[PDB]
Structures are given as structure tokens and as C-alpha cells.
């Protein structure tokens, strides 16, 4: 679901480092190297906010309390 705070191998915090990653591909025309501007030099903490499925935004559109 949500971004896995505190990436697995290392201990860096990457919670806040997705909503500012997504608006780099979105509007900067950059490639996957965009995340390098975020301060991720290793490649353990880099296979986290690169290849993570944010599978919540497809799941939050299921409220039973829709009132509609």
C-alpha cells in the first residue's frame, strides 16, 4: 500500500520522498535519474521509491460510506 517508510536494507527515511518524487516525473520531463536530486546515493534506498506501487490510490475509491 503506502510507501514503505524507512526502506528495507538501509535505514534512511523515504516516507516524504515519494510525493516529491512523483512531481518530478510529472513536471520536470526527467527520467528515472530524477530521484538522484532527492539525496539517494545507495541502490538499496533507491529501489524503494523508484519501483514502488502506490496501490492505495486505487483502493481508497471503495468507501462503503459513500453516501451516494
Cβ distance to another protein smaller for residue 37 or 42? 42
Q: Which residue is nearest to Zn ion (CB)?
A: 10
Cβ distance to another protein smaller for residue 11 or 31? 11
Neighbour count for residue 24 (Cβ, 10 Å): 17
Rounded Cα distance between 66 and 63, Å, is 5
Which of 26, 30, 43, 56 contacts another protein by CB under 8 A? 56
x/- site string to another protein, residues 9 to 48, per CB under 8 A? -xxxx-xx-xx----------------------x------
Instruction: Give the DSSP per-residue string, 9-44.
Output: SS----STTTHHHHHHHTTT---GGGGGGGT--SSS
Amino acid at each position: 500500500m503506502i510507501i514503505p517508510i524507512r526502506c528495507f536494507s538501509c535505514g534512511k527515511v523515504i516516507g516524504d520522498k515519494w510525493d516529491t518524487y512523483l512531481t518530478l516525473l510529472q513536471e520536470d520531463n526527467t527520467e528515472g535519474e530524477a530521484l538522484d536530486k532527492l539525496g539517494l546515493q545507495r541502490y538499496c534506498c533507491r529501489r524503494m521509491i523508484l519501483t514502488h506501487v502506490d496501490l492505495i490510490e486505487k483502493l481508497l475509491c471503495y468507501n462503503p460510506l459513500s453516501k451516494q
